[PDB]
Scaffold this active site. Structure first.
Site, PDB file in Angstrom:
ATOM      1  N   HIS A   1       0.823  -1.212   0.000  1.00 46.01           N
ATOM      2  CA  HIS A   1       0.000   0.000   0.000  1.00 46.01           C
ATOM      3  C   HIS A   1       0.857   1.261   0.000  1.00 46.01           C
ATOM      4  O   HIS A   1       0.319   2.369  -0.122  1.00 46.01           O
ATOM      5  CB  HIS A   1      -1.023   0.006   1.141  1.00 46.01           C
ATOM      6  CG  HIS A   1      -0.429   0.320   2.479  1.00 46.01           C
ATOM      7  ND1 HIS A   1      -0.075  -0.663   3.382  1.00 46.01           N
ATOM      8  CD2 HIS A   1      -0.126   1.501   3.065  1.00 46.01           C
ATOM      9  CE1 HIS A   1       0.413  -0.092   4.471  1.00 46.01           C
ATOM     10  NE2 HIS A   1       0.393   1.213   4.304  1.00 46.01           N
TER      11      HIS A   1
ATOM     12  N   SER B   1       4.098   2.986   8.045  1.00 42.78           N
ATOM     13  CA  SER B   1       3.777   1.884   7.116  1.00 42.78           C
ATOM     14  C   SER B   1       4.967   1.528   6.291  1.00 42.78           C
ATOM     15  O   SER B   1       5.689   2.411   5.841  1.00 42.78           O
ATOM     16  CB  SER B   1       2.728   2.301   6.104  1.00 42.78           C
ATOM     17  OG  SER B   1       1.439   2.031   6.587  1.00 42.78           O
ATOM     18  N   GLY B   2       5.090   0.239   6.024  1.00 45.65           N
ATOM     19  CA  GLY B   2       6.183  -0.241   5.201  1.00 45.65           C
ATOM     20  C   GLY B   2       7.459  -0.500   5.942  1.00 45.65           C
ATOM     21  O   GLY B   2       8.361  -1.171   5.424  1.00 45.65           O
TER      22      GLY B   2
ATOM     23  N   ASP C   1       0.339  -7.666   1.912  1.00 46.73           N
ATOM     24  CA  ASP C   1       0.744  -6.270   1.869  1.00 46.73           C
ATOM     25  C   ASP C   1       2.248  -6.145   1.930  1.00 46.73           C
ATOM     26  O   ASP C   1       2.844  -5.791   2.938  1.00 46.73           O
ATOM     27  CB  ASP C   1       0.064  -5.504   2.994  1.00 46.73           C
ATOM     28  CG  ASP C   1       0.222  -4.024   2.865  1.00 46.73           C
ATOM     29  OD1 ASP C   1       0.597  -3.540   1.779  1.00 46.73           O
ATOM     30  OD2 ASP C   1      -0.039  -3.313   3.849  1.00 46.73           O
TER      31      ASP C   1
ATOM     32  N   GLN D   1       0.608   6.350  11.501  1.00 46.64           N
ATOM     33  CA  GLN D   1       0.685   6.862  10.140  1.00 46.64           C
ATOM     34  C   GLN D   1       2.065   7.414   9.883  1.00 46.64           C
ATOM     35  O   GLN D   1       2.605   8.175  10.697  1.00 46.64           O
ATOM     36  CB  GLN D   1      -0.378   7.941   9.901  1.00 46.64           C
ATOM     37  CG  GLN D   1      -1.725   7.360   9.503  1.00 46.64           C
ATOM     38  CD  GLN D   1      -2.343   6.476  10.564  1.00 46.64           C
ATOM     39  OE1 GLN D   1      -2.905   5.394  10.257  1.00 46.64           O
ATOM     40  NE2 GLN D   1      -2.281   6.921  11.808  1.00 46.64           N
ATOM     41  N   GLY D   2       2.632   6.987   8.764  1.00 48.49           N
ATOM     42  CA  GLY D   2       3.977   7.382   8.372  1.00 48.49           C
ATOM     43  C   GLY D   2       4.953   6.257   8.672  1.00 48.49           C
ATOM     44  O   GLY D   2       6.091   6.311   8.228  1.00 48.49           O
TER      45      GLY D   2
ATOM     46  N   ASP E   1       2.669   1.989  19.823  1.00 41.16           N
ATOM     47  CA  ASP E   1       2.225   1.419  18.550  1.00 41.16           C
ATOM     48  C   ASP E   1       2.947   2.096  17.414  1.00 41.16           C
ATOM     49  O   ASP E   1       3.589   3.138  17.604  1.00 41.16           O
ATOM     50  CB  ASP E   1       0.733   1.712  18.391  1.00 41.16           C
ATOM     51  CG  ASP E   1       0.001   0.761  17.427  1.00 41.16           C
ATOM     52  OD1 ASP E   1      -1.238   0.898  17.412  1.00 41.16           O
ATOM     53  OD2 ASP E   1       0.604  -0.081  16.715  1.00 41.16           O
ATOM     54  N   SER E   2       2.853   1.498  16.233  1.00 40.79           N
ATOM     55  CA  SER E   2       3.227   2.204  15.014  1.00 40.79           C
ATOM     56  C   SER E   2       2.043   3.052  14.585  1.00 40.79           C
ATOM     57  O   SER E   2       0.902   2.826  15.014  1.00 40.79           O
ATOM     58  CB  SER E   2       3.591   1.220  13.914  1.00 40.79           C
ATOM     59  OG  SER E   2       2.560   0.266  13.759  1.00 40.79           O
TER      60      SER E   2
ATOM     61  N   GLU F   1      23.323  10.285   4.660  1.00 37.17           N
ATOM     62  CA  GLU F   1      22.240   9.815   3.808  1.00 37.17           C
ATOM     63  C   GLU F   1      22.708   9.339   2.463  1.00 37.17           C
ATOM     64  O   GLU F   1      23.721   9.800   1.941  1.00 37.17           O
ATOM     65  CB  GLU F   1      21.240  10.926   3.546  1.00 37.17           C
ATOM     66  CG  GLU F   1      20.645  11.488   4.803  1.00 37.17           C
ATOM     67  CD  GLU F   1      21.374  12.701   5.342  1.00 37.17           C
ATOM     68  OE1 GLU F   1      22.556  12.931   5.002  1.00 37.17           O
ATOM     69  OE2 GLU F   1      20.744  13.410   6.161  1.00 37.17           O
TER      70      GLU F   1
ATOM     71  N   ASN G   1      17.527  12.451  11.094  1.00 33.28           N
ATOM     72  CA  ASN G   1      16.639  13.588  10.983  1.00 33.28           C
ATOM     73  C   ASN G   1      16.239  13.731   9.532  1.00 33.28           C
ATOM     74  O   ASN G   1      17.039  14.157   8.698  1.00 33.28           O
ATOM     75  CB  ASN G   1      17.345  14.864  11.453  1.00 33.28           C
ATOM     76  CG  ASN G   1      16.415  16.031  11.512  1.00 33.28           C
ATOM     77  OD1 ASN G   1      15.513  16.164  10.690  1.00 33.28           O
ATOM     78  ND2 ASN G   1      16.617  16.905  12.512  1.00 33.28           N
TER      79      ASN G   1
ATOM     80  N   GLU H   1      19.175   7.814   6.958  1.00 30.58           N
ATOM     81  CA  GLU H   1      18.537   8.957   7.573  1.00 30.58           C
ATOM     82  C   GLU H   1      18.415   8.830   9.073  1.00 30.58           C
ATOM     83  O   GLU H   1      18.154   7.750   9.600  1.00 30.58           O
ATOM     84  CB  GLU H   1      17.118   9.110   7.039  1.00 30.58           C
ATOM     85  CG  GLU H   1      17.022   9.654   5.629  1.00 30.58           C
ATOM     86  CD  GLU H   1      17.209  11.157   5.562  1.00 30.58           C
ATOM     87  OE1 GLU H   1      17.559  11.768   6.588  1.00 30.58           O
ATOM     88  OE2 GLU H   1      16.990  11.717   4.477  1.00 30.58           O
TER      89      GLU H   1
ATOM     90  N   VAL I   1      16.747  17.272   7.829  1.00 33.00           N
ATOM     91  CA  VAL I   1      18.053  17.930   7.805  1.00 33.00           C
ATOM     92  C   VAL I   1      19.041  16.966   7.184  1.00 33.00           C
ATOM     93  O   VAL I   1      19.103  15.785   7.580  1.00 33.00           O
ATOM     94  CB  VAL I   1      18.529  18.267   9.234  1.00 33.00           C
ATOM     95  CG1 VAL I   1      19.860  19.006   9.200  1.00 33.00           C
ATOM     96  CG2 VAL I   1      17.474  19.106   9.970  1.00 33.00           C
TER      97      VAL I   1
END
Ligand code: CA
Lengths: 56, 223
Positions: free
Chosen positions: B40, B177-178, B84, B174-175, B171-172, B62, B54, B52, B57
């Site tokens: 998804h 995911s994956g 998924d 939004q953001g 918990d995990s 990176e 931050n 990564e 920044v």
């Protein structure tokens, strides 16, 4: 419209669905109310949105 | 991640950020050219951001590498979130070092009680929104399928598991995911979905990676 069982993916944007199963109807905002072909029909809303409806 | 802690820069070296305009999902580096994420999380224009901490920044460790191929599991069903899982091939191989490293695929499934590390740059609030700059971490156990299925009646397939805390608060979100659920050094889960985040009685649901190892290996071998 309301939803008691709302689940969302944890992505951005969130993709959320109401998983409520209700007899004969979905919530009033549902664009795709999927029903069984039983008596009574069990229906749930297939809509995916970036929000959940308020609890019922 | 709600109720977690600041991981520490590059302490989760297999965690990547998927960026298409903004950070929108995480992923896990599984070798120099491949990332595992959720199906998804497929989006146009994905740039994979490795090393990564931050994400707002440039800190100097990176690597920004465009995604070149998306391979969504052939049985992914957006109606159910079953299967998924998605592989992302990087346009060029990442340079692997202390701060960018792959995570091993599992040889066997984890089960209830397995203690895992979940990480990501997702929302840190259960109510409302707060998006962190730096990577957050959460230690969480895999939960009984009985608890999982009870929490999400009719929705938990054999390719999902719940992890977290029924009491809420951790918990995990939004953001996330994956992103990874790593247990004893193996990628056992992919952050997938849940009812809100960190709510009592509503643990997070995760893709069960161990069911896909053969497909992942065959896919990487052919692509
Ligand atoms: Ca950075």
């Amino acid at each position: 419209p309301c939803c008691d069982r709302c689940e969302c993916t944890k992505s951005i944007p969130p993709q959320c669905r109401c998983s409520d199963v209700r007899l004969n109807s979905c919530h009033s905002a549902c664009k795709s109310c999927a029903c069984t072909f039983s008596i009574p029909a069990q229906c749930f809303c297939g809509d995916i949105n970036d929000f959940c409806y308020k609890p019922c | 991640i709600v109720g977690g802690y600041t991981c520490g820069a590059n302490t989760v070296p297999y965690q990547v950020s998927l960026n298409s305009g903004y950070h929108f999902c995480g992923g896990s580096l599984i070798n120099s050219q491949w990332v595992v994420s959720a199906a998804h999380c497929y989006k146009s224009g994905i740039q994979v951001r490795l090393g990564e901490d931050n994400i707002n920044v440039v800190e100097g460790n990176e690597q920004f590498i465009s995604a070149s191929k998306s391979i969504v599991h052939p049985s992914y069903n957006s109606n159910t979130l079953n299967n998924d899982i998605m592989l992302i091939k990087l346009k060029s191989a990442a340079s692997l070092n202390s701060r960018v490293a792959s995570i091993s695929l599992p040889t066997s499934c984890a089960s209830a009680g397995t203690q895992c590390l979940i990480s990501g740059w997702g929302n840190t609030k259960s109510s409302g929104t707060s998006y962190p700059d730096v990577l957050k971490c959460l230690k969480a156990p895999i939960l009984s399928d009985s608890s999982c299925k009870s929490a999400y009646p009719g929705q938990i397939t054999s390719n999902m598991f719940c992890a977290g805390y029924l009491e809420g608060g951790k918990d995990s979100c939004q953001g996330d995911s994956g992103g990874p659920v790593v247990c004893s050094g193996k990628l056992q889960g992919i952050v997938s979905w849940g009812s809100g985040c960190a709510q009592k009685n509503k643990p997070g649901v995760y893709t069960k990676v161990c069911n896909y190892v053969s497909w992942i290996k065959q896919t990487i071998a052919s692509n």
